[PDB]
Amino acid sequence: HMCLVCSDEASGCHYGVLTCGSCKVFFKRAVEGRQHNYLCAGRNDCIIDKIRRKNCPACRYRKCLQAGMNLE
Amino acid sequence: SHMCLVCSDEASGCHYGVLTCGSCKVFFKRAVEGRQHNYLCAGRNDCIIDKIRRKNCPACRYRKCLQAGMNLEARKTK
DNA sequence: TAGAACACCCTGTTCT
DNA sequence: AAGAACAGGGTGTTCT
Ligand SMILES: [Zn+2]
Ligand SMILES: [Zn+2]
Ligand SMILES: [Zn+2]
Ligand SMILES: [Zn+2]
């Protein structure tokens, strides 16, 4: 019942991982564009939780990958 | 000189009392009008706020606006 | 479940 | 200088 990426409430397995809906669509958008232009403003370790996941796409997106998320 | 004191992009004038670029000018007005907006840093409250990163952390960008002295009444303060 | 799309929000520029 | 508002993007939900 918990997103592996942002620890929000998960809506099932998306792209191989238990994630919420916001993290599902975020991951899709990133891998298809787009992630090449992401740059963390901290230290590549931002907190990704429900309230702060919007802040750093670079860390969000790295969390996605590390959690296993994958297209096929 | 000619650089924004909040983000270091090219400053365009002295806005709300401080040399800043246009994007920080309207960021700051939008932050202090209405609110609470609210902004939280996902880092350690010391994010790098520059042209390429200032969108990532409105919390640190707003703190840098305040720390530089921005204030609405800077005009009517003569 | 994967993807479309809408509504809403944030940003930075123009303002004929 | 200050402020409105347009255009462009991002987010997250609903819908299919
Ligand atoms: Zn999530
Ligand atoms: Zn980060
Ligand atoms: Zn600036
Ligand atoms: Zn920050």
Side-chain angles (χ1 to χ4, degrees), chain B residues 14-16 25-26 29-30 75:
Chain B
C14 171
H15 319 284
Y16 303 113
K25 164 181 169 295
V26 67
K29 177 63 175 308
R30 272 154 185 164
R75 225 201 169 152

Side-chain angles (χ1 to χ4, degrees), chain B residues 50-66:
Chain B
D50 63 359
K51 182 163 209 315
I52 52 197
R53 290 162 271 199
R54 58 195 183 205
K55 300 178 179 56
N56 297 12
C57 192
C60 279
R61 182 172 194 182
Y62 183 64
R63 162 182 60 74
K64 276 186 81 173
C65 289
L66 295 180

